[PDB]
Amino acid sequence: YNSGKLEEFVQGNLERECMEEKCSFEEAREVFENTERTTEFWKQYVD
Protein backbone atom coordinates (compact mmCIF):
# COMPACT_ATOMS: atom_id res chain seq x y z
CA TYR A 1 0.00 0.00 0.00
CA ASN A 2 2.61 2.50 1.13
CA SER A 3 1.11 5.35 3.12
CA GLY A 4 4.01 6.30 5.42
CA LYS A 5 1.83 8.90 7.06
CA LEU A 6 -1.09 8.30 4.73
CA GLU A 7 0.23 10.11 1.66
CA GLU A 8 -2.83 9.21 -0.42
CA PHE A 9 -4.74 10.63 2.49
CA VAL A 10 -8.17 11.75 3.56
CA GLN A 11 -9.91 12.37 0.28
CA GLY A 12 -11.01 15.94 -0.34
CA ASN A 13 -8.76 17.06 -3.19
CA LEU A 14 -9.44 20.61 -4.31
CA GLU A 15 -7.01 20.05 -7.19
CA ARG A 16 -5.55 23.13 -5.59
CA GLU A 17 -1.76 23.03 -5.68
CA CYS A 18 0.32 25.40 -7.83
CA MET A 19 -0.38 25.67 -11.57
CA GLU A 20 2.90 24.79 -13.25
CA GLU A 21 5.10 22.89 -10.79
CA LYS A 22 2.21 22.56 -8.36
CA CYS A 23 5.06 23.39 -6.03
CA SER A 24 6.45 20.00 -6.92
CA PHE A 25 8.35 19.60 -3.61
CA GLU A 26 11.48 21.73 -3.23
CA GLU A 27 13.51 21.53 -6.42
CA ALA A 28 12.07 18.05 -6.99
CA ARG A 29 12.62 17.57 -10.71
CA GLU A 30 11.97 14.10 -9.35
CA VAL A 31 12.90 12.63 -5.94
CA PHE A 32 16.56 12.40 -6.87
CA GLU A 33 19.15 13.54 -4.31
CA ASN A 34 17.62 12.21 -1.11
CA THR A 35 16.40 8.70 -1.89
CA GLU A 36 19.33 6.94 -0.21
CA ARG A 37 18.12 8.01 3.23
CA THR A 38 14.78 6.34 3.76
CA THR A 39 13.78 2.66 3.65
CA GLU A 40 16.93 1.49 5.41
CA PHE A 41 17.49 4.16 8.04
CA TRP A 42 14.06 4.09 9.62
CA LYS A 43 13.81 0.30 9.50
CA GLN A 44 15.49 0.08 12.91
CA TYR A 45 13.31 2.66 14.68
CA VAL A 46 10.07 2.24 12.76
CA ASP A 47 7.40 4.49 14.25
Cβ count near 32 (within 10 Å): 8
Closest C-alpha to 46, from 8, 6, 4, 7: 4
Annotated binding site: 1-2, 7-8, 15, 17, 20-21, 26-27, 30, 36, 40, 47
Please give the method by which this entry was determined: NMR
Q: How many helices (H) and strands (E) does the chain have?
A: 0, 0
Look up residue 19 and give its amino acid.
Answer: M
> How many angstroms separate the CA atoms of 3 and 16, rounded?
21
| CATH topology (fold) of 1-47 | Coagulation Factor IX (4.10.740)
Longest dimension (CA), the chain: 39
> How many angstroms separate the CA atoms of 27 and 31, rounded?
9
CB contact at 8 A, 34 and 27: no
Look up residue 25 and give its amino acid.
Answer: F
> How many angstroms separate the CA atoms of 22 and 15, rounded?
10
Q: Using CA of residue 30, residue 33, residue 34, residue 36, what is the dihedral sign?
A: positive
Annotated binding site for Ca(2+): 1-2, 7-8, 15, 17, 20-21, 26-27, 30, 36, 40, 47
